Design a protein around this ligand. Structure first.
Ligand SMILES: CCCCCCCCCCCCC/C=C\[C@H](O)[C@H](N)CO
Ligand SMILES: CCCCCCCCCCCCC/C=C\[C@H](O)[C@H](N)CO
Ligand SMILES: CCCCCCCCCCCCC/C=C\[C@H](O)[C@H](N)CO
Ligand SMILES: [K+]
Ligand SMILES: [K+]
Ligand SMILES: [K+]
Lengths: 236, 40, 265, 235, 265, 40, 49, 49, 265, 40
């Protein structure tokens, strides 16, 4: 179906031009098991205060738009009680729900790929800056979309979880991601597990005189979260 | 028969099967059957 | 569910209907197409017995490849254990995000002159493994070569090649071929980015047990993974490597060869 | 002790061998296995995913523009849109795809292929196209009558954005070679046929609309597909 | 029906009759004669225990023979894998139209001077198998010798000979020792005739791991078929071979030696 | 006993029998017995 | 390990020998056998023509 | 006797190896074990002090 | 009671009470603290499967290490059997007061010139074990080398290394790595103190069976304990060794590195 | 299986367990429980 409603904590989202929902690697987010756990102190599970939708500032699909990205959990590291719990604790674990929105008339044509990639490094340059590697809640521009910022073909990104927004068909994309790592928990301030990338593959065009200014908007929820190792608050 | 103490000593595995690829090819929340239209 | 052969084919007849439409698809949803052959044309019966074993992880990964090649200087050399210098095995391991495996190492050694011309001369050699925080030998005759705690192998250039197995030795639950993070707290320097210190397991050090006159050892190392397990397939590498310890690359405007027009095959 | 005799091949180092060996650390116990999403057991699972074809590979075309096929409003009938050879290991548009890179790790292939196309015009844009597969025996077909004598589909642009053509396995032997290189081994023997696209009607638009639109082209293996004899990727 | 010995002989008495005529035959029909010994003369009983095993396909084919012999130039040489250069094993395989078999290959190597006089000197050698579409090495030190995907064997001129098995590797259901056809569509050129590209499986490439001074490797290869199956026996070859890849021949007016007259044995 | 994984590794076959040669020696549609005349 | 003694004829290459050996491609599966007319098992069948 | 093939790693001296070997004194019988206080089996027992 | 893994962890809740006080302790009593983790903080369940095998006596002691290294003078040398010359294995054995074990000895030998440069030359060597009260050979050709009662091993510099096992050979019920006493009655001399004559089991003597011209043997010996048993753990050694047969040492005012202040980590 | 006559010939032991450390950690005549005070 083409209608959907997502509800988490005190927050709700609706859409009328959906295209199903993706659940990455066929798994939903879940808790750490007693056989797989290592840290011995009792974990913190904040519930509805952390697990709810947050909305990041918007991006304009200009004439020159090459693409944009966000790092998780960097982007949400300074927002609400997700942010404060992540600063006060040494270790973090959890999954995500993601919803990308972009609307335009029946007189517009264009297409975006919306893709979530595990362990994505920035490496077109000898020495990536801290600004490029951790761009915060504003995100940063793609300078090298054809090589996917990492030395692979853009065309083969579809091995990672993705959807398309095609302006003749749909106006939103939805992804659900579980926790992925080689260890049971990790530092939230030193390591980013996922990157969310939005890339135009067919450029934006329209009937002469139609509305030219078209935003793209990203909304994100933490899901199934736990923390260990409480201390004072610490940031990079 | 294994001649040595630790399993790192053993020879290569012989369980060379494949499995259903739907965790990578069709990872969607609601089912879409072959004969139907996808969006309805 | 698990299979030992590829899928069979059944007979199929003509169809004229409004009720069944297998050719129509929506790529927007993120799913790959589900149209079968039998739905799209009239087919015959085929019992297909082709197997799937050469494309298993054991199939693809289970054979030896070069990881190091060096000569001694003043009767000694050392090597940091890391699979980045030779690109063929490097490019295969970066098809997975996380992997667990054991390794079988093979060592081949020979004597050369100062003009790098080979010599018919049999000599004893020693290889020592030195984990991080252990002291490495300084030269051919240092007292760290007693090897009472550190493992060693001792052998001769006229026997067949030396070989040992090693188990899965990481502090993590798998090795990592991509790492989007920094080495340590309070050091966001650009040289501290995209290295996991957890894959670094130490050095090998090599000597001749006695001093050669004018000649040197030349040494090669081959590695073979065994008992592979793997998670989260990655896009394959498509530009040249530049550096041993980083993924750095240079951009270019195409990947395949050009042609005269889109309508000419 | 026991009398023995040692045979030729003694002391040889064969890289694809398989024997038991002494371990450097006999008492070492490794960390536990934990639950991680997305375990893979066979690369046939990966090759079955769709990836984009670099179809517009001509001199003046660079970067992301090389993934788009053009369409435009016509003023004459039955015209051609694109052509390509279907051979998956061959140099050209297919070579950078997932299916192309794994096929370049092996010498022989067998099975059906899935080609899938998606339209990216406005909601108001309409048209119909015909897509044909031609088995081997000569050159690519020179007209729409010559093309529609082989395996084909007619595609109508509407609500469902996309269509699949299946290229079925029609071969003399059980396997084909992945190279088509003629200078030494005469392997042009194994060439597998062509795929071509023509206008069935025309692309039609309202007043002041964009008169040019794009298609995107995806390729994947079907469930009867397989590979033999590993070799070193030439890229 | 199957037999492990040749046929016995029974007793036979005189015959005077119109009713039974085993000596009369008609060669026109395409059948070989069916007159038995016992029908044509008076015979005695013989229990015959001679076996039939030396003339089985395993019997006739199951032993090693020479397929290649060459020297290195600038520390390298390569060989196209094809059994045409040495005529003895070639002439045996062309007694069948179609065959399936596995092969056991044996490699023997030694060092020579520039005057082709042998040298008492032990050296490491490497053999690499390069299937079609793979890049072959250019010289003694090219980076294709890492061998991480292509199979290799590495060995020394002072060990016993190297040996490996290989399975039935054709894309067809059998190899072909006769092929009445052309290589490809739209090329009826006379050099494109009577070659099957399906028997071509690639090259072997050989090097010394290090540079010899003045000396060269000389190398010989022997092949032995195993587990033979065979269809449609052919007439045996009766004129000299001329070329490695074709059946070309020159005519002559006889096959056996002449004599003074037909009435003189 | 076989020591290796693939059958190409195994030693030579030991089933060295012969069989009735009539598929090459008498491949005719109608039977012609020894004691009779062939053409009648 | 086990004590052993190695006999004369060790390391010799006899062309009519018969031993098991390691295979270059251990996981390779060959094409099927198909029905073809005129299979031969012994050359005594041919010499009788 | 039995045909054999000898593999790489033949004749190597690896310090962490573990094989049976011939004894210099085959008939020697050692003194008895006596009761002594403070036997240790694992150095984890010591590190816990 | 015996265990194959380390201890698990259980869940624990808050406590407010006068009745239970696990944090209070009295070090005066000579006992180590018994406060568990779960008593001191709120804990979660953890099933812990880490093993304990690398820290067993067999684990820690069961690998070979160097005990002797020497050259022949006039075709002979001898060695007093004692593990004091090389400090790494010495420092490990002095972690126990008393031990019983068998030993596996490995001998590695080679030819050198007068400039201590190695030589490609194969020679026969002999090693003889001479218990106390037996006559040792005087030179390369003495008649004690008949070896009809004393054990010998004979070998060649071009075979692999020589190796033999030895059982527990002391007159005592264990070897001793500390001995607070004198060698004999009526001799309280300071050189008679802290030696047990019961660990002394004799010499090894080495020769070349024939006279080398100008060259010498160089020889190394490695020892590996097997089947360890151990009593009464000692404090570990913390100052350099000075002498082969005694524990003598020099004092110094610290053991670890200094820092600027006690309040700065 | 053991090939030689004397036990000094045999390979290394495989009984790599640990045991309760109280003979070194708490060697006292009267018991002092975790929850109690030591001196009373
Ligand atoms: C005496 C024999 C020497 C054996 C020394 C063994 C050391 C252990 C090596 C384990 C292999 C580690 C592989 C892990 C990761 C790779 O290096 C990646 N390329 C790191 O980026
Ligand atoms: C490292 C060892 C090298 C092994 C390389 C094996 C390649 C496979 C060879 C299979 C034998 C093919 C025989 C087929 C046909 C004959 O060549 C005919 N004379 C062709 O006309
Ligand atoms: C032909 C092979 C030679 C074998 C000779 C064997 C002799 C017996 C040696 C047993 C080992 C004795 C170890 C006892 C104590 C240590 O030496 C201590 N460091 C003494 O302070
Ligand atoms: K099947
Ligand atoms: K008979
Ligand atoms: K436990």
């Amino acid at each position: 179906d083409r209608v959907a409603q997502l509800t988490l904590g005190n927050s709700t989202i609706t859409t009328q031009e959906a295209a199903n929902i993706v659940v990455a690697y066929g798994r939903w987010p879940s808790g750490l098991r007693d056989t797989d756990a290592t840290a011995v102190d009792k974990p913190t599970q904040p519930g509805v205060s952390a697990e709810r939708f947050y909305t990041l500032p918007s991006v304009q699909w200009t004439t020159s738009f090459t693409g944009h990205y966000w790092k998780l959990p960097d982007a949400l590291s300074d927002l609400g009680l997700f942010g404060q719990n992540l600063q006060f604790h040494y270790l973090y674990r959890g999954g995500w729900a993601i919803h990308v929105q972009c609307n335009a008339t029946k007189f517009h044509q264009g297409t975006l790929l919306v893709v979530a990639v595990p362990e994505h490094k920035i490496q077109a340059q000898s020495n990536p800056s801290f600004g490029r590697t951790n761009p915060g809640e504003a995100g940063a521009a793609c300078q090298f979309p054809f090589t996917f910022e990492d030395g692979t073909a853009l065309g083969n990104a579809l091995i990672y979880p993705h959807q398309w927004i095609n302006l003749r068909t749909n106006n939103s994309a939805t992804l659900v991601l579980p926790y992925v790592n080689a260890i049971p928990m990790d530092s939230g301030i030193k390591h980013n597990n996922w990157t969310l990338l939005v890339i135009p593959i067919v450029p934006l065009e329209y009937a002469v005189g139609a509305t030219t200014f078209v935003p793209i908007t990203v909304t994100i929820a933490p899901m199934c979260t736990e923390y260990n190792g409480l201390r004072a608050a610490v940031t990079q | 028969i294994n001649y040595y103490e630790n399993a790192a000593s053993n020879s290569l595995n012989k369980q060379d099967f494949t499995q259903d690829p739907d965790k990578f090819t069709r990872p969607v929340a609601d089912i879409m059957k072959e004969a139907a239209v996808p969006l309805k | 569910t698990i299979k030992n052969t590829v899928e069979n084919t059944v007979e199929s007849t003509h169809s004229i209907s409004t009720e069944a439409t297998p050719a129509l698809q929506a790529a927007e949803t993120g799913a790959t197409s589900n149209a079968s052959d039998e739905s799209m044309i009239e087919t015959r019966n085929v019992v297909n017995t082709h197997g799937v074993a050469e494309t298993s992880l054991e199939g693809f990964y289970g054979r030896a490849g070069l990881v190091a090649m060096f000569t001694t200087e003043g009767g000694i050399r050392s090597w940091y254990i890391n699979f980045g210098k030779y690109v063929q095995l490097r490019a295969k391991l970066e098809l997975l995000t996380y992997a667990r495996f054991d390794v079988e190492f093979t060592i081949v050694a020979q004597v050369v002159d100062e003009q790098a011309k080979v010599k018919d001369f049999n000599v004893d050699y020693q290889v020592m493994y030195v984990p991080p925080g252990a002291s490495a030998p300084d030269g051919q005759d240092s007292f760290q070569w007693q090897s009472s705690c550190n493992p060693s192998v001792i052998s001769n250039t006229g026997l067949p090649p030396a070989r040992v197995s090693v188990p899965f030795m990481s502090s993590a639950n798998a090795y990592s071929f991509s790492y989007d993070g920094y080495i340590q707290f309070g050091d966001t320097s650009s040289s501290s980015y995209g290295i996991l210190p957890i894959h670094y397991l130490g050095q090998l050090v090599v000597r001749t047990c006695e001093d050669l006159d004018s000649a040197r050892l030349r040494v090669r190392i081959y590695a073979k993974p065994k008992h592979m397990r793997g998670w989260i397939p990655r896009s394959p590498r498509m530009r040249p490597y530049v550096s041993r310890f980083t993924g750095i690359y240079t951009d270019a405007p195409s990947f395949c060869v050009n042609r005269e027009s889109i309508t000419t095959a | 002790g026991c009398p023995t005799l040692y045979t030729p091949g003694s002391g040889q180092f064969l890289t694809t061998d398989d024997f038991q060996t002494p371990c450097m650390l006999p008492k070492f116990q490794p960390t536990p296995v934990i639950d991680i999403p997305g375990e893979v057991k066979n690369f046939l699972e990966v090759i079955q995913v769709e990836s984009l074809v670099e179809i517009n590979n001509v001199s003046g075309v660079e970067g992301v523009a090389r993934y788009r096929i053009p369409l435009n409003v016509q003023d004459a009938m039955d015209g051609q849109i694109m052509a390509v050879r279907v051979d998956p290991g061959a140099d050209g548009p297919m070579q950078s795809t997932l299916l192309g890179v794994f096929t370049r790790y092996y010498t022989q292939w067998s099975g059906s292929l899935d080609f899938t196309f998606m339209f990216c015009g406005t909601f108001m844009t309409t048209g119909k196209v015909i897509i044909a597969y031609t088995p081997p025996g000569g050159d690519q077909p020179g007209s729409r009558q010559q093309a529609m004598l082989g395996t084909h589909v007619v595609w109508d642009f509407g609500l469902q954005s996309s269509i699949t053509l299946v290229v079925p396995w029609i071969s003399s032997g059980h396997f084909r070679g992945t190279s088509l290189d003629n200078t030494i081994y005469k392997y042009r023997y194994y060439e597998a046929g062509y795929i071509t696209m023509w206008y069935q009607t025309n692309m039609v638009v309202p007043p002041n609309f964009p008169t040019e639109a794009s298609i995107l082209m995806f390729v994947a293996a079907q469930p009867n597909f397989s590979l033999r004899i590993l070799k070193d990727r030439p890229d």
